[PDB]
Design an enzyme around this catalytic site. Sequence first.
Site, PDB file in Angstrom:
ATOM      1  N   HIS A   1      -2.337   9.720   4.402  1.00  0.00           N
ATOM      2  CA  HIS A   1      -2.140   8.820   5.538  1.00  0.00           C
ATOM      3  C   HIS A   1      -0.880   7.962   5.429  1.00  0.00           C
ATOM      4  CE1 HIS A   1      -4.235   5.738   2.995  1.00  0.00           C
ATOM      5  NE2 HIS A   1      -3.408   4.929   3.633  1.00  0.00           N
TER       6      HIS A   1
ATOM      7  N   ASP B   1      -7.608  12.877   1.533  1.00  0.00           N
ATOM      8  CA  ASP B   1      -6.437  12.032   1.732  1.00  0.00           C
ATOM      9  C   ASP B   1      -5.478  12.045   0.545  1.00  0.00           C
ATOM     10  OD1 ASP B   1      -4.763  10.165   2.891  1.00  0.00           O
ATOM     11  OD2 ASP B   1      -6.074   8.458   2.438  1.00  0.00           O
TER      12      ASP B   1
ATOM     13  N   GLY C   1      -0.851  -2.133   1.987  1.00  0.00           N
ATOM     14  CA  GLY C   1       0.279  -1.962   1.090  1.00  0.00           C
ATOM     15  C   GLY C   1      -0.118  -1.301  -0.223  1.00  0.00           C
TER      16      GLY C   1
ATOM     17  N   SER D   1      -2.334   1.347  -0.386  1.00  0.00           N
ATOM     18  CA  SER D   1      -2.590   2.769  -0.141  1.00  0.00           C
ATOM     19  C   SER D   1      -1.669   3.700  -0.912  1.00  0.00           C
ATOM     20  CB  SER D   1      -2.452   3.106   1.347  1.00  0.00           C
ATOM     21  OG  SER D   1      -3.643   2.818   2.046  1.00  0.00           O
ATOM     22  N   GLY D   2      -2.239   4.797  -1.404  1.00  0.00           N
ATOM     23  CA  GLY D   2      -1.455   5.774  -2.139  1.00  0.00           C
ATOM     24  C   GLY D   2      -1.387   5.459  -3.616  1.00  0.00           C
TER      25      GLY D   2
END
EC number: 3.4.21.1
Lengths: 58, 239
Positions: free
Chosen positions: B53, B98, B187, B189-190
Amino acid sequence: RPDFCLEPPYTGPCWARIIRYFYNAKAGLCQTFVYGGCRAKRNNFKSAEDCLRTCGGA
Amino acid sequence: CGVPAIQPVLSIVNGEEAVPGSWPWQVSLQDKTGFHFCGGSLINENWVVTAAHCGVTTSDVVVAGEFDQGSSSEKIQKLKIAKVFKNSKYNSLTINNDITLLKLSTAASFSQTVSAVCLPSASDDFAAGTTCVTTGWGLTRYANTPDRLQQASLPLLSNTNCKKYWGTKIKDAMICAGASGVSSCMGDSGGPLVCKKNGAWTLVGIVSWGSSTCSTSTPGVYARVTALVNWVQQTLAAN
């Protein structure tokens, strides 16, 4: 113009910090907001130009 | 992998500032202007794993060895992205699967502040209650991002306990953690959710989604790496 242009910006449940544009009917211009990365509503554009071409004047 | 040259000091909303360089695999994904939009984890010198995402493109850059994003003097590595491999099974509606892999144009130069996190085996079982750690430059209050890298220790939750809140929104390639006084946030995410495997920090989850207000009493949801690691290995082997 589409009614989705009158909806407030929607960040969503994902935790990214992505800059997107939304039309602000109160001001008559497209403004930036932080999008979370998923489940975007329609008043969410990748450029101010796209936003103005779709929602300008709403 | 999984062994920082600089040991972290333990004990993101309600987390704590990390020891500079103690999470060497943590990278910052930024646009061409330097704007941080997501985190990521180095799995070797040429690949970074992040969330699908995050929508990374080859125009974005991987920043490794960073601690203080507000420091212009701090030495870091701005790495270009050669190709983006988004898992074709990523479901843009349910957010399941994801995960995305980034192949660097130029290999990262490993050092005391830049190295890789270990990947788990598809069969690994990280029991619920296990205390793990997540890191990132996401919001510390639900607002601008903190300049210095943050960290937080949090427990993994059983699918049953997670579903007590999120119900059927929890899918097979997701694992929950948190609801313990801390929370990943915009911020983050990932970024990584790591747990020790034989003492080595191993990537168990990738920050994905959760409370829309980053509530610390709500389960955070991460992409379950064990369910996606075979795809990872296959992608590396073919590229």
